[PDB]
Design a protein around this ligand. Structure first.
Ligand SMILES: NC(=O)c1ccc[n+]([C@@H]2O[C@@H](COP(=O)([O-])OP(=O)(O)OC[C@H]3O[C@@H](n4cnc5c(N)ncnc54)[C@H](O)[C@H]3O)[C@H](O)[C@H]2O)c1
Ligand SMILES: NC(=O)c1ccc[n+]([C@@H]2O[C@@H](COP(=O)([O-])OP(=O)(O)OC[C@H]3O[C@@H](n4cnc5c(N)ncnc54)[C@H](O)[C@H]3O)[C@H](O)[C@H]2O)c1
Ligand SMILES: NC(=O)c1ccc[n+]([C@@H]2O[C@@H](COP(=O)([O-])OP(=O)(O)OC[C@H]3O[C@@H](n4cnc5c(N)ncnc54)[C@H](O)[C@H]3O)[C@H](O)[C@H]2O)c1
Ligand SMILES: NC(=O)c1ccc[n+]([C@@H]2O[C@@H](COP(=O)([O-])OP(=O)(O)OC[C@H]3O[C@@H](n4cnc5c(N)ncnc54)[C@H](O)[C@H]3O)[C@H](O)[C@H]2O)c1
Lengths: 384, 398, 386, 384
């Protein structure tokens, strides 16, 4: 179920590709919601579902007094939320310009509920989230495996693999804490954690099991209107700030920075995206590379662009896994497609056999991703 | 006229500093409004005056209906266009959402007026702007030689320099064409030019090469869109022929998402992308080691730049030379409790006890004309014009 | 059906030959004008047919009043307009020295209408020509691929492949745009885009290790027109459709150096300019060199310059030529008794030549341009032991 | 004497400049009919006088009926011989197509007169043309010595000199062949000797360190001919004198059709277009390479295209041109009266140009073969 250069590839060639690939100089992984679904995570679609099923007042006000969606479109489960927050800032700044002190109520209620659904669907474990004994659960059956498999396909004098994802929650950090592996996601210390580029370039020397981490959703990173961000336990941050977001139902000020909103200029100085995409750009600009994606929602405009440039590195055999790939092709054939859907279907249909895309379906899940990677052989020896 | 922390600067120190800079990763120069008078463009003051003198009847909406502006800011011209135009677009979008007709029409006409006034001086040529081979006029002569000095100091194999501009003029294209150099600016192609930001990470090689990275900061006349939000660029002729003239002198004729300037459509990710990416490349450029940054003759009318510089002081390789014609007057004004944001910002910046702070109070000497006049030229340097004579002689043959 | 050096060869051996050639030092293709015929183009014979059908009564009157070309000659489709245009300039210069004013109009009609027809057939699109989003057309599905196989079959320390052709159109920058490929065309700048041979010494590379490709267009181009400024400029083509195409088509003015395209027998008519002087020079620098192979689409071979040099260039073993020629049995039977045209004799010249260095292919559908495109096997990736 | 940049120069500086100019990667010499005036040659004015005297009547038909030239224009001797010949042939083709026998014969007579005038005076050997070993004549001895000066000054391992001629006679080649020197002008063979362009991209090598060079012919030759093959079949002069040239030159009236190739006759067909267009072409390729100098001697700049090429080369900022005019003083005197043609206007304007890149060496006798030979030095090792 692998397509490259407009032609199919066989299982033996797939295995040879994998075996050759594991030993390349550099390897990296990015993934969307191909795994968080099993763990119980919530995506933007679930945010829309909850907003539909819990808020009739604001949704009805939008439907008629603003006319920002139709019933059929909402039923189709395709409405956007990040652009909705952008237009919410538009409306509310217009109100603060002309000072309409009634609309402010509804729009700030919408923002409160929205950012609530954003920063309150990242737990996956209820109020147990702040407790201890987290990584040990077996619900990470395959997750943990991945990290292990990617710290054995190595030889002395090689850099650690780089990892990317779209996870709001901290599932993979939980697996790391379980396995005792030395991850890295920007900060150092316990009492004080401050952003520093230099902290992203730390490597260990045995006198090893480790790996890297980089979240697109980013922020345990709290800013109490102090122009700075710091990190401490989920339990402390819970006892301190988000407790007030439990039984108050008040307005949401942008104290601590999390960025699901598309219009970056809504927060013109957002400074967590830059590092993640600097890392991604560095990862593109190298031969002997590999990127995997599996049911990665092609919904970001800035993620469908660097990849088209990335195709111009041949040994960058960019990989795709998408069980529901029929929708994009069907839309392209008749009536055109969306923006990122068109971008990815254009990525695939580049004459190179380097571009590799998987649309197998039931076999494209995270289970295939974990199982396909084999374990290393220390001494191949002479096989003749 | 030049002071370095109360000290005196001589020719030897300047020559040593220039020589040290010439062997650095990046070398560049910057010019402000004072030195950009000759380019032929117009500032925000001209646009605001023309708007308030050509559509006085619409001053009510900015205050009497939406509070977009005050009177003191308008009285002393303390309004930055980008904010007002952005608010106009916000009101237009909300009017579209709310099916409001009168406000829609008012904002459409206001946008038309501001566009008509702003677009005037961006051509740099006028009626003959559509004509190809625009470099025939001598106005661009000064643009050519200087560019050479920005790259002539680079030895073979050295990293190419960069050029930064404040306004949205397009003199660099014609200057490079006259000199015969190409610049990578996202756009690329012949028929369907599109914006490749990966284009930055490229280089040339010799089988058996100097260039520069071109950045368009505050918009552009040649910028546009094609019915798909995809960013395209085209030579000046088609832009001045098809759509620009209609906008200028077609009365009531405006549309939706077709033009990208100045910082206009940020509520749409597609446009914003361009400015965000250019700023990202700038910000990660200063993160380089052994890099030289220049802030020359700048009024510091922006807020993000100053805060970014303050937060980026961790780099021990920051050197700044700024021209400021009138300093005693501004010091007196701020001391009494007056002054604008720019004056306060520059005064605070200059109050750092460092030996890298240089202040120039030569007045008109800060202008481009005076700077050119003061400089000498080599005897053997080619300054005379011979292409015109050769072309005339060739045409004379029959 | 398939021959190499006067003997018969099988398809598998030809495929092995192609695979072995692909790894040599130099690669490049000479897409015959007929390659663009499928892209909406037309041949010189089609131009003759159009010029006959648009002026039927006038053509008949000219034929029966001066008999430059007999009606039977056109009926059999054995007319060479390439000679006709040189004939026309000859006649009209003779008259202009004779000053006959009445005769100074029919030849104007013939020449200007021929130029209009050539340019119109070279547009390839028509009214939609100026509309953008070209590359999305499915027709280029092969042409597109043709330019992606010349960057994957190369490694560090190798030259930049170049593309020869005999086409009016610009259908190489179209794929370039559609795939972001830099097919260096020898031009610099955009606002005033002028050709410069010095641009034939630039190649792309990856700083942290990029792709590139060259361009060699023999048959001029529509965009290449000069106003007696002895210069050629490259501005867009949609920009053109309103500029001069309709204008000249709907102005009815005397002909001049309207745009630099060459229908006519005299190739050195360009005795004043340089274009003609910078599209063979490197051709000769190419075909004669160690580890070289000039690809061709095989039909006709009806020139006095390129083929003349091509045959004589074979004196060194490294050069190889692979061509297709289905017309083997019929042509052999016709030429066995009697003689043939210059082109037919030139092409059958190599039948007597037994050099394995030359190749010929046939078999009808097996000898199409699609076979040429598919005969560019993918570069070795993840090699293993079989 | 010598004027560079509008100022005179001394002998020492000129000698130093000439000595330093010998660092060229490739060396070539350009010649023509200008240098043959002082050795007893004939000019175009003599040719026109001979034509008018032999067959004056013809001058009428072309001059008045066909308007091939004005009466005063003809009297001024401003008709290009090859162009008039070619357009007479074009008239003949017109007559063949449209069957106007009167003009056909009236033009056959004119063409026969033209070839009787040019071919008869071009053999330059009389009855010795049919003889062999024509290189033993002492009349060319001086010329032979000049060749030594061009080859004796080149160190071993350097490129041998090249010879360019603007006329279309083999007298210089006959003189040079007496020394057993080999020249590559794209010809080879004995019994069917032909014209081959690949010779321009091939050369010999020495394994015991002898003489080689390239010759270029532009305006035709005394031999170049044809026989129903569209080729260039060069053979020994005696074959030609015994085959068809005998029947043409001295006979009362005789002319054949598509048989002759000179002095640029049938440019209305491809046959010669490839020849000339591939012999002057390489001359341009000589100036393509950077840092190469060209010398002009015995050439009157009789073609506007040559001035066009010179000016186009001058457009680049790294090109230098040296101009030799045998009759500069006469040209200045003639144009001082307000007359002169387009070529005279162009050359006078170029001379008046005040640039340091213009060098003029013209004093009448100083531009002749004898003065040119005397000015040049002799080899130091040559016995004296
Ligand atoms: N922190 C930053 O600076 C930054 C910068 C850019 C983008 N982002 C975030 O990065 C972008 C990531 O895109 P996302 O929101 O779609 O990621 P997500 O994991 O939160 O959501 C899953 C996405 O994948 C699609 N999908 C559906 N089924 C799937 C499956 N079985 N497997 C995988 N995907 C499936 C969904 O349509 C889509 O929601 C978000 O738009 C945005 O929240 C963050
Ligand atoms: N990619 C980017 O760099 C980027 C990012 C965000 C916005 N923008 C653009 O920025 C938005 C608006 O920016 P702007 O026009 O307000 O900035 P600006 O052009 O006004 O900043 C420079 C100005 O300062 C003035 N000035 C006053 N005193 C001066 C002095 N003493 N010396 C020099 N100059 C002096 C000058 O007239 C003028 O050059 C546009 O909407 C948008 O196009 C660009
Ligand atoms: N300035 C320069 O660079 C320069 C120099 C020399 C010549 N030229 C020009 O170059 C010469 C090009 O010759 P031409 O264009 O007349 O050749 P052509 O188009 O007449 O011949 C090509 C051949 O391809 C055959 N064919 C039929 N079907 C085909 C198919 N499917 N694929 C491929 N071929 C098929 C056709 O029978 C035959 O026309 C012109 O004579 C001349 O105008 C230009
Ligand atoms: N170089 C090319 O590529 C090319 C191509 C086509 C035609 N041609 C023409 O082909 C040749 C045939 O024409 P041609 O019959 O006149 O032969 P040619 O070489 O003798 O032409 C030069 C003419 O200049 C005249 N002249 C006047 N003043 C002179 C002076 N001071 N010194 C020397 N000559 C002086 C000569 O009488 C005469 O020789 C011409 O030389 C040349 O114009 C050249």
């Amino acid at each position: 179920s692998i397509y490259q250069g407009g032609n199919k590839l066989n299982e033996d060639d797939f295995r040879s590709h994998v075996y050759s690939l594991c030993q390349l100089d550099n390897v990296g992984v990015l993934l969307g919601a191909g795994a968080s679904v099993g763990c119980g995570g919530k995506t933007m679609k679930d945010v829309w579902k909850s907003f539909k099923q819990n808020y009739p007042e604001l949704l009805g006000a939008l439907i008629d007094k603003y006319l920002l969606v139709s019933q059929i479109d909402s039923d189709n489960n395709l409405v956007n939320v990040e652009l909705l927050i952008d237009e919410a800032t538009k409306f509310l700044s217009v109100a603060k310009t002309r000072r309409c002190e009634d609309e402010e109520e509804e729009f700030r209620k919408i923002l409160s509920s929205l950012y609530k659904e954003v920063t309150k669907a990242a737990l996956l474990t209820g109020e147990q989230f702040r407790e201890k004994n987290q990584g040990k659960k077996d619900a990470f059956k395959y997750h943990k495996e991945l990290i292990s498999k990617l710290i054995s396909n190595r030889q002395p004098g090689q850099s650690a693999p780089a990892i990317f994802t779209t996870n709001y929650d901290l599932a993979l950090e939980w697996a790391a804490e379980d396995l005792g592996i030395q991850l890295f996601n920007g900060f150092s210390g316990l009492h004080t954690r401050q952003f520093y580029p230099q902290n992203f370039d730390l490597a260990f020397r045995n006198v090893h099991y480790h790996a890297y981490l980089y979240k697109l959703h980013g922020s345990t990173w709290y800013q109490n209107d102090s122009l700075t961000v710091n990190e401490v336990s989920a339990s402390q941050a819970y006892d301190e700030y988000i407790n007030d977001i439990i039984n108050k139902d008040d307005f949401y000020r942008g104290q601590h920075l999390i960025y699901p909103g598309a219009n970056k200029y809504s927060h013109t100085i957002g400074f967590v995206y830059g590092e993640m995409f600097r890392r991604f750009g560095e990862f593109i600009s190298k031969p002997q590379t590999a990127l995997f994606i599996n049911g990665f929602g092609f919904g970001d405009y800035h993620i469908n662009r660097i990849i088209l440039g990335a195709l111009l590195n041949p040994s960058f055999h960019v990989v795709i896994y998408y069980p529901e790939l029929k929708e994009a092709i069907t839309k392209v054939s008749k009536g055109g497609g969306s923006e990122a859907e068109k971008a990815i279907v254009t990525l695939k249909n580049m004459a190179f056999n380097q571009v590799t895309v998987v649309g197998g379906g039931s076999k494209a899940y995270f289970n295939s991703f974990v199982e396909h990677l084999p374990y290393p052989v220390l001494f191949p020896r002479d096989n003749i």
